[PDB]
């Protein structure tokens, strides 16, 4: 077990049931790959600096988690398989590094 912060960008032109649904495939997988969720932060739509999938916007999730180290990679793969998931980036969790 180690702490990671799964980031996810979803298709922005979804209706709320599909979006709820995608979130479902996602949360089932987090569970299936032995990830235990801690925080969660859903800032939803947000304008991208450049188009992803030819599209100026993206729907943003995020999840501090605790999971088996060996399973983080396979999870990122399974998280990507959906045509509506457009990025995954699973980062090792770390302490802030402050300035000023």
């Amino acid at each position: 077990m180690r702490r990671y912060e799964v980031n996810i960008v979803l298709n922005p032109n979804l209706d709320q049931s599909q979006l709820a649904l995608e979130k479902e495939i996602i949360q089932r997988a987090l569970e299936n790959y032995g990830a235990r969720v801690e925080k969660v932060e859903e800032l939803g739509l947000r304008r991208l600096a450049y188009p992803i999938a030819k599209d100026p916007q993206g729907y943003f999730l995020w999840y501090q988690v605790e999971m088996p180290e060996d399973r983080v990679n396979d999870l990122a793969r399974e998280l990507r398989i959906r045509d509506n998931v457009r990025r995954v980036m699973v980062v090792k969790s770390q302490e802030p590094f402050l300035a000023n």
Partner: peptide, 14 residues
């Protein structure tokens, strides 16, 4: 720039 900002996280990518 470092001056024209208050305390911030350098590791905070969001």
């Amino acid at each position: 720039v470092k001056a024209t900002l208050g305390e911030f996280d350098l590791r905070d990518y969001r």
